[PDB]
Amino acid sequence: MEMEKEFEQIDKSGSWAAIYQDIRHEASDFPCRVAKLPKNKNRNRYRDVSPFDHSRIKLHQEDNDYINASLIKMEEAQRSYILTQGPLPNTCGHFWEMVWEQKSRGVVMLNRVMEKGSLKCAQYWPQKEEKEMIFEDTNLKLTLISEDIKSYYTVRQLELENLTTQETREILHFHYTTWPDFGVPESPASFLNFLFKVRESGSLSPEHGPVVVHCSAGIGRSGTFCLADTCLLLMDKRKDPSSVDIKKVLLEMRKFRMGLIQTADQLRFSYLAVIEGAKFIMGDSSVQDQWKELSHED
Numbered sequence: 001m002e003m004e005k006e007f008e009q010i011d012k013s014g015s016w017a018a019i020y021q022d023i024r025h026e027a028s029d030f031p032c033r034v035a036k037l038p039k040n041k042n043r044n045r046y047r048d049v050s051p052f053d054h055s056r057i058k059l060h061q062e063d064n065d066y067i068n069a070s071l072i073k074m075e076e077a078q079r080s081y082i083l084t085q086g087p088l089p090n091t092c093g094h095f096w097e098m099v100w101e102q103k104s105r106g107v108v109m110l111n112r113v114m115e116k117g118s119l120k121c122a123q124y125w126p127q128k129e130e131k132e133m134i135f136e137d138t139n140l141k142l143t144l145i146s147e148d149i150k151s152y153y154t155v156r157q158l159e160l161e162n163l164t165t166q167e168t169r170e171i172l173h174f175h176y177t178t179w180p181d182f183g184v185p186e187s188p189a190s191f192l193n194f195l196f197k198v199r200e201s202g203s204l205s206p207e208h209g210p211v212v213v214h215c216s217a218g219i220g221r222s223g224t225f226c227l228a229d230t231c232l233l234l235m236d237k238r239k240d241p242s243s244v245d246i247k248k249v250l251l252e253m254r255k256f257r258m259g260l261i262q263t264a265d266q267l268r269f270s271y272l273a274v275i276e277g278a279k280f281i282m283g284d285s286s287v288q289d290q291w292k293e294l295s296h297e298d
Ligand SMILES: CCc1cc(C)nn1-c1ccc(N)cc1
Pocket: 073, 074, 075, 078, 079, 080, 203, 204, 205, 206, 207, 208, 209, 210, 211
């Protein structure tokens, strides 16, 4: 059964919430004892979003190795991702330490620093070339080299320098800037064009460490990115769009980080993204359309 026919049935029955709640009941639960240590309270944005001990990323420092970040290892798809919360004002150094140590080439950001009048993450990268950031706690310097601001996303080139060695590396920052404040995008076209730009950059290739993906909590919008990417990889590897079950893939990813996909709307969106991405790859350009009637509803 094509995913598209499954989607039509779920939409007809209105059963997105039911299917989502079934995934939540079936999801793994593993300990997160390190995350819950008192000394780590100020390293977590939310008390109920924690990395599992088995898959947490460890910082390579002796002081405190903890960061709210998880390694998602998709063995059949042969890709890995690090899912993390948006950095806090006191964890921006830790975030770039992670990027350095894990050898990541790309960072993928799916939120705005400010949304609905609230701080969703710290301003952890420089906005101006001439005003570089120094993270004194982890001995890193970060400079903005260039940016390309497009309608639905921005791509930045950053230089990250290890001040202990003076080694430098180029990091690509892929920033999806147009996720709505409420709900999900009506069409996945722009999010798929984003995804494909990330892939085109080389950042997801096996010569690099895992891409770092975040939103505010690092489970909801972040989960949609990783889920859509891996489902598309599996469709290509099995040479059968129809053998991939997105609910099974999501449950597999939830072995590595709790909570991935946080609403029924996000689950529907991830399905739409994978369907429309597969259709685009197979020759359908119309799924990039977002033609709308003339309206002035605002
Ligand atoms: C050999 C490639 C492989 C297998 C698995 C499970 N992950 N990766 C991988 C792929 C790409 C990146 N950027 C990082 C890691």
